[PDB]
Amino acid sequence: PRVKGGTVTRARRKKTIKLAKGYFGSKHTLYKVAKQQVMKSGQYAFRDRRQRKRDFRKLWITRINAAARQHEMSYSRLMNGLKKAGIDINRKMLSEIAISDEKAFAQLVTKAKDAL
């Protein structure tokens, strides 16, 4: 019995055209290019889901480094001092502590300056 490939190619191509919703120009109306761009998008996303973890890490580094020099002490010494004191607060939490609660950041900086 013959079978004619109707109503399956349509759906498969449409659910990639729709998945390319909002791409420039001809990349959001043609299957032959929408598919390539969606493939590339998935690849880029898979890389960036890793890159983000380190981008935000170094963002917290920059903020902590800026905060430390307001107290005449550098990031390297600051982190070494907290390691000596036994404090195990993430770089993220130091970033928000520095932004929000200046007194507390000063207090733990002293407790780290004194852990020399």
């Binding site: 963002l59 800026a66 993220k92 928000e96």
Partner: protein, 145 residues
Amino acid sequence: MRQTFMANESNIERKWYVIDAEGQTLGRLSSEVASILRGKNKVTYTPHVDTGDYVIVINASKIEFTGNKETDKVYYRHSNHPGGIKSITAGELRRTNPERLIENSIKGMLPSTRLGEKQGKKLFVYGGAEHPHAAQQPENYELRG
């Protein structure tokens, strides 16, 4: 995507700072000034918005140089014409148009992104003790050596 603060233009406050150059080497002043106006000393730093402060440089002719790059350290620049390459030494800039010397040394220390240009426009370099920006109320700033 949990809880990192992001600065936006409703909460950015930029201040003004005068940094004297009498007795301060080009690179070791320009790098620090670039850090200033980039905003990397703001605990509320944010990469995708222009945090960071304004900077004024007042003397800009009392710059000293190490070694003998008075005659060396020639700047080049092209006019996009065939054989259109002419050059000028650092001393000639320091006596003629010394403001450009520092204004070009710092902008080379910032990115070339659009934020880079909008940040470099926050710099006003003058070649003589007086600055015309007393209305923005500047604060002397000392350099961390």
